[PDB]
Amino acid sequence: DWTCWSCLVCAACSVELLXLVXAAXGAXTAS
């Protein structure tokens, strides 16, 4: 059940950039 909310976990990516990719999901809210 992917969604803009699940993209929040992407913000937890601080040790790497891969996890930061999920940030794209955040756009779901900012739209």
* Pair 10, 26: CB distance under 8 Å: yes
Task: Retrieve residue 20's tokens.
Answer: 């930061």
Method: NMR
Integer CA distances (angstroms), 1 to 4, 14, 16, in order:
10, 24, 24
Instruction: End-to-end CA distance of the chain: give it in Å, rounded.
Output: 19
* Pair 28, 19: CB distance under 8 Å: no
- For the chain, the farthest-separated pair of C-alpha atoms sits apart, in whole angstroms, at 28
Task: Retrieve residue 6's tokens.
Answer: 């699940």
What is the spatial distance between Cα 15 and Cα 31, in angstroms, rounded to a whole number? 28
